[PDB]
Design a binder for this molecule. Sequence first.
Ligand SMILES: N[C@@H](CCC(=O)N[C@@H](CSCc1ccc([N+](=O)[O-])cc1)C(=O)NCC(=O)O)C(=O)O
Ligand SMILES: N[C@@H](CCC(=O)N[C@@H](CSCc1ccc([N+](=O)[O-])cc1)C(=O)NCC(=O)O)C(=O)O
Lengths: 209, 209
Amino acid sequence: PPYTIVYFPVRGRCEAMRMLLADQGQSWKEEVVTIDTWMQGLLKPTCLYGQLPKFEDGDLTLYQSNAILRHLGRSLGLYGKNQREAAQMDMVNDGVEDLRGKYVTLIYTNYENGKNDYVKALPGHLKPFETLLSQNQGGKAFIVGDQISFADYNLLDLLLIHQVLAPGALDNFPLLSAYVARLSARPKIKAFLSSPEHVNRPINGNGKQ
Amino acid sequence: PPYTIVYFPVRGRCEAMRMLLADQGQSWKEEVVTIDTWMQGLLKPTCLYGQLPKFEDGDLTLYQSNAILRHLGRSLGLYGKNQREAAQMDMVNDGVEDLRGKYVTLIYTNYENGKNDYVKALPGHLKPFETLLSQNQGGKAFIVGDQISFADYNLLDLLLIHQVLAPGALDNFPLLSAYVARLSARPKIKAFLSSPEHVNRPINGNGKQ
Ligand SMILES: N[C@@H](CCC(=O)N[C@@H](CSCc1ccc([N+](=O)[O-])cc1)C(=O)NCC(=O)O)C(=O)O
Ligand SMILES: N[C@@H](CCC(=O)N[C@@H](CSCc1ccc([N+](=O)[O-])cc1)C(=O)NCC(=O)O)C(=O)O
């Protein structure tokens, strides 16, 4: 700490890290970058890869959302109890990222002509996570192990935005449905998902969801 | 150990982990999966996300090429000396993965009409790495710190395949140019690059590069 999130005024690739920080009783500063400011092209060239979010943790400045998540997981003790779990958490998080990428592509470049197809192939992309849960404590714990990890927050966010994209998304996924509800009931999470900062923030930059 | 790699008969997303292993004096098993076999539909359904590569350390089965790289780097001591370096290495690796995905799309779905534009935009995508190096001992050491990390093997592979795609891609990037020469000059790595299993193996599965 202190923690500072530099991002556009949307949930997008930052809602997961915010739930993590909130569920760990951490406070952070939000630096909102409007599209107008970004179009001026002043901040963009200063970003390592020309993109946001940008994260500041004390003297450390990071880019790449997944790198930020892993940093928080490693520093706040949300990365498993050993190398074996750490590897499994990375495997889970990479899967989460692959789906988010496709979700993003759908939202921003082909929403009206590709939603039906996307929702059609969605169960196939969610099944792996249902399987993962079934293999861990029968699915009554977390995605990996008995302790919540950064992967959980990223996966939770992914599942939540897909339930908005497709209402009955988890109908045929009992473990994932109970998983989402279980984590959403976590006091700090419930409070976060209920806060105005979160409610007032649109899921994506084009309003589509 | 023992290490087993289940992948297609290409370098693709496994050449990086392969150089890493070889450079660490490690040996492994190569289970080559041909297109024909893959189209038989027996292995795919058994893969966590329906894709390869698949990895086996003996008791632990992994998927996601970056999870594998991170796992090897973590268990073999190639993940930095502290939390700060590990975070920056992740930031590096994420950036490498971002460009690899675009590289992959070009080669497999739009090589002909997209190469011109891709190579034109390539300098802008490599610059960040040139910059990172200039901020780490003038680029005399590694991508992050002075110790080789899983991130270095991934970046090296990325730079090498782009050198074949666009000769002179590093003409305006002296630090990256040297970076590649040096690491490729490493005894274990140099031996790998000259091995028949590597030499005979195509970069991609569609004969393009
Ligand atoms: N791999 C990187 C990917 C980052 C990325 O896609 N960043 C986008 C924003 S998230 C998606 C997004 C886009 C636009 C808005 N908006 O409000 O206008 C919000 C979110 C960006 O910086 N775009 C600016 C640019 O490239 O010039 C990561 O995971 O952090
Ligand atoms: N995020 C995953 C992505 C894995 C991925 O894209 N895997 C591809 C192979 S690498 C790219 C590739 C494609 C084809 C060949 N080939 O020889 O025909 C080789 C490599 C795959 O399994 N495709 C099968 C499928 O989706 O059905 C990772 O990083 O490991």
